[PDB]
Coordinates of N, CA and C in Angstrom, one line a residue:
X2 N 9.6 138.0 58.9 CA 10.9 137.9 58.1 C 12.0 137.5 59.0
X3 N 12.8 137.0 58.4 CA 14.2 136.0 59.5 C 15.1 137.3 60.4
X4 N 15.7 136.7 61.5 CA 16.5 137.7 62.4 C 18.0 136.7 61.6
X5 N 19.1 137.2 62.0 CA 20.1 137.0 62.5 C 20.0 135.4 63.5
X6 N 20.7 134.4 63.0 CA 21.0 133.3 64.1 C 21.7 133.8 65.2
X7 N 20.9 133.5 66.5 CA 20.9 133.8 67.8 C 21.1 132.2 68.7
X8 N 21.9 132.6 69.9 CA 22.1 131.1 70.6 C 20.4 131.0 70.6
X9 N 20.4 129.2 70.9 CA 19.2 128.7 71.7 C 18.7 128.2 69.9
X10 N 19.0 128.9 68.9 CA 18.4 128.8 67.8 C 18.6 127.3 67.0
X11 N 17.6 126.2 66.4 CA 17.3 124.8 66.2 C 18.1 125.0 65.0
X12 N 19.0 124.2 64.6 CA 19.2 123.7 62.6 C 19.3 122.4 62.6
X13 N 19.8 122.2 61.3 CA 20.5 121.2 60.8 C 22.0 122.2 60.6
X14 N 22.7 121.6 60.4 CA 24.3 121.6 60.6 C 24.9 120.6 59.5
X15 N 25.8 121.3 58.6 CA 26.1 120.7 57.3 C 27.3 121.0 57.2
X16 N 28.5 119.7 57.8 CA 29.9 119.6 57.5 C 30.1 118.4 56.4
X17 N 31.2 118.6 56.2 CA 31.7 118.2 54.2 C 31.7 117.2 54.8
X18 N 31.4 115.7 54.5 CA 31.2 114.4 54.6 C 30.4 113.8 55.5
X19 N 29.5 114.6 55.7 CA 28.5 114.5 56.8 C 27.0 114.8 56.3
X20 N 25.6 113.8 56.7 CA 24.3 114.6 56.2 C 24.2 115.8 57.3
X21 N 23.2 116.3 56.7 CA 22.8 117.5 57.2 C 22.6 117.0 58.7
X22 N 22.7 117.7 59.8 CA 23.0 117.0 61.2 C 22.2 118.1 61.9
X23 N 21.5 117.6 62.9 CA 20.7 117.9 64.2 C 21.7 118.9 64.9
X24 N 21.4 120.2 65.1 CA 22.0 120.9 66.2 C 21.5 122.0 66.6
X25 N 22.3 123.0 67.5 CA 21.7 124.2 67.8 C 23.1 124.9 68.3
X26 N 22.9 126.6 68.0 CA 23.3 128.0 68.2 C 24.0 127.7 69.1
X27 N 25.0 127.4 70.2 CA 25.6 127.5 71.2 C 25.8 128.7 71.9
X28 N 25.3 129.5 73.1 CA 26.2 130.5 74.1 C 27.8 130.0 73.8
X29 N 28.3 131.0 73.9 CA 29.8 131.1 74.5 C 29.7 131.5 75.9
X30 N 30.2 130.2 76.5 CA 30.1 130.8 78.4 C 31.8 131.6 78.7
X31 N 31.2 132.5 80.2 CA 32.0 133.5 80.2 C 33.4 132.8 80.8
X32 N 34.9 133.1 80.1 CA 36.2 132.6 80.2 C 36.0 131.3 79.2
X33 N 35.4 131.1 78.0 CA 35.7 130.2 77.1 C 36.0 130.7 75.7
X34 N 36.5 129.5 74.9 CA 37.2 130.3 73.6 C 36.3 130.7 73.3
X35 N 36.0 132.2 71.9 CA 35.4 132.5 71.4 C 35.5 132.1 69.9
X36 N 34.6 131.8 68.8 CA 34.5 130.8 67.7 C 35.4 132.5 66.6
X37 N 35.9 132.1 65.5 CA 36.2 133.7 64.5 C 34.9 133.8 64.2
X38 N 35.5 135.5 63.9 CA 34.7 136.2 63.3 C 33.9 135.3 62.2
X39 N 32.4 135.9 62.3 CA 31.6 135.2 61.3 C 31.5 133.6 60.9
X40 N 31.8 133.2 62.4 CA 31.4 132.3 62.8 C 30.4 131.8 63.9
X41 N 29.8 130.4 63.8 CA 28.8 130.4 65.0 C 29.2 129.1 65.8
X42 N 29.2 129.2 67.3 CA 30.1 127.9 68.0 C 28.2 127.1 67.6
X43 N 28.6 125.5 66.9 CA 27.4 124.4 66.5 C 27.6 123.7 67.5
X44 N 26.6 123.6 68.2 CA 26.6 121.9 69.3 C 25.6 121.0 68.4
X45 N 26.2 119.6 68.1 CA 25.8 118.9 67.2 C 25.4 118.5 68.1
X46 N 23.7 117.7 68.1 CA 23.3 117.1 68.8 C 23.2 115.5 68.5
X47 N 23.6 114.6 69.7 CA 23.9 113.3 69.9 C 25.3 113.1 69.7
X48 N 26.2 113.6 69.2 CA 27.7 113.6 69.2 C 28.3 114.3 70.4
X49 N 27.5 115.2 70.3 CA 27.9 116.6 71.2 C 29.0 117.3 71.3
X50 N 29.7 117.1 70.0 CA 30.5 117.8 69.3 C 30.2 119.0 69.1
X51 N 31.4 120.2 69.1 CA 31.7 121.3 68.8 C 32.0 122.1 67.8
X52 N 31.5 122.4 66.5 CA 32.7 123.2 65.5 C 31.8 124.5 65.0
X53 N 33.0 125.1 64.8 CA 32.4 126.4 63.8 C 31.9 126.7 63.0
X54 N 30.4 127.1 62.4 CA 30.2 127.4 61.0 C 29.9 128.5 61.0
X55 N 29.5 129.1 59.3 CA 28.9 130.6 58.8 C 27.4 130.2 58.4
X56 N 26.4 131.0 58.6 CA 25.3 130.7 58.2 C 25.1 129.6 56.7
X57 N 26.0 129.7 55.9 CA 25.7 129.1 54.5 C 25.2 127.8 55.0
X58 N 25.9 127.3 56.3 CA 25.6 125.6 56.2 C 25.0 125.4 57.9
X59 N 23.5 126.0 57.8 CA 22.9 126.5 58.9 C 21.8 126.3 58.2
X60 N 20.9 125.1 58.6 CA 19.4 125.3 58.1 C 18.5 125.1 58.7
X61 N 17.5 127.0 59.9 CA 16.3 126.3 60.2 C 15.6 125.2 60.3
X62 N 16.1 124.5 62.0 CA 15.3 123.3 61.5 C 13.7 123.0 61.4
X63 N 12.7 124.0 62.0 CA 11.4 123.8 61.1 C 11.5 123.5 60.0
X64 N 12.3 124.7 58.9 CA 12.1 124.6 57.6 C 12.2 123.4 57.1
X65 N 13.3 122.3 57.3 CA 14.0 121.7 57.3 C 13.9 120.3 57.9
X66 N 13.0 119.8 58.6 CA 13.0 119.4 59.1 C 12.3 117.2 58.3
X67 N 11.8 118.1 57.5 CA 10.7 117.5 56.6 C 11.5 116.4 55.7
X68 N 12.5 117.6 55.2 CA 14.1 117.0 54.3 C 15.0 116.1 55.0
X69 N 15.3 116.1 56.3 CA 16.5 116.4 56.9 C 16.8 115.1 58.1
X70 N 15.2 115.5 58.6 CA 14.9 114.8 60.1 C 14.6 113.2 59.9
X71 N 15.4 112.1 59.0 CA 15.2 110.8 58.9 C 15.9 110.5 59.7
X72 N 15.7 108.6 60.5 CA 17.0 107.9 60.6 C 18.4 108.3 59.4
X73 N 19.1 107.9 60.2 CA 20.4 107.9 59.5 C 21.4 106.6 60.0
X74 N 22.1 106.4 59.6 CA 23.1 105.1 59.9 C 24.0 105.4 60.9
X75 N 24.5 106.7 60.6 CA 25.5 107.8 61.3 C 25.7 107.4 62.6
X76 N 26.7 107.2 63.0 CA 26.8 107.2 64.5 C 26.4 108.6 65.4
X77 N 25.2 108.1 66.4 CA 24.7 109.6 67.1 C 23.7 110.1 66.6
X78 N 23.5 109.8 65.2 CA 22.5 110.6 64.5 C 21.3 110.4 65.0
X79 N 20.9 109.2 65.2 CA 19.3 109.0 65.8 C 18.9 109.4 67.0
X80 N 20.4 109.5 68.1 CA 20.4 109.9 69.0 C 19.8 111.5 69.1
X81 N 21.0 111.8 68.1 CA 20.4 113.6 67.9 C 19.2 113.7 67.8
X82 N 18.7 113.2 66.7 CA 17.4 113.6 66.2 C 16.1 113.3 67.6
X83 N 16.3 112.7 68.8 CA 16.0 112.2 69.4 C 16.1 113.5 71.0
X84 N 17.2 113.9 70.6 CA 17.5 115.2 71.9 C 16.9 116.5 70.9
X85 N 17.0 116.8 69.7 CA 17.2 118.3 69.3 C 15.0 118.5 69.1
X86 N 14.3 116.8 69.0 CA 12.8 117.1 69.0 C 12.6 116.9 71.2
X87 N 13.4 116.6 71.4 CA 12.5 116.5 73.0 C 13.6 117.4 74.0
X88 N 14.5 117.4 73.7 CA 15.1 118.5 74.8 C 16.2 119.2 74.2
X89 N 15.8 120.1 73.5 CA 17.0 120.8 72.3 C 17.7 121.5 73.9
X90 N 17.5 122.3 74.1 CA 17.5 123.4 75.2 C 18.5 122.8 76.4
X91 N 18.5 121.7 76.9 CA 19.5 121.0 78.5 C 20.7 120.8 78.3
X92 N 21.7 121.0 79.3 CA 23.1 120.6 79.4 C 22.9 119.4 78.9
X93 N 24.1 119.3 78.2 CA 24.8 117.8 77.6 C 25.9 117.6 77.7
X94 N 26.9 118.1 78.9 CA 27.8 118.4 79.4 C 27.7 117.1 80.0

C-alpha cells in the first residue's frame, strides 16, 4: 500500500497549461529555500525547472507511465522523458 511522497520519488508533474510532465521528488539541500507547507520542491525533468506542488498533481510514474510517457511537441519534453527512464537519479545542475 502507498507511503507518503519521499525525495528520489519518479512522477508525472501536472501544471495548468502543461501535459502531464516527467519529474521527480527533489531533496531540499542544506542553506536552500524551503518549498510551503504541503508542498513538494518538483524537478521537471528536461526543463530542469523548479516549482511547488501538493500531491493532487503528482502521479506515480509507473502507474502512469503507460498514459503519460508519449512524445510530446513541448519544448524539453522528449528530453525529459529521455533522462526521468535512463538517469532519473544524477545532477542536472
Amino acid at each position: 500500500m502507498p507511503h507518503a511522497f519521499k525525495p528520489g520519488d519518479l512522477v508525472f508533474a501536472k501544471m495548468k497549461g502543461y501535459p502531464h510532465w516527467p519529474a521527480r521528488i527533489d531533496d531540499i539541500a542544506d542553506g536552500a529555500v524551503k518549498p510551503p507547507p504541503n508542498k513538494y520542491p518538483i524537478f521537471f525533468f528536461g526543463t530542469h525547472e523548479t516549482a511547488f506542488l501538493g500531491p493532487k498533481d503528482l502521479f506515480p510514474y509507473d502507474k502512469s507511465k503507460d498514459k503519460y510517457g508519449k512524445p510530446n511537441k513541448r519544448k524539453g519534453f522528449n528530453e525529459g522523458l529521455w533522462e526521468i527512464q535512463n538517469n532519473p537519479h544524477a545532477s542536472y545542475s
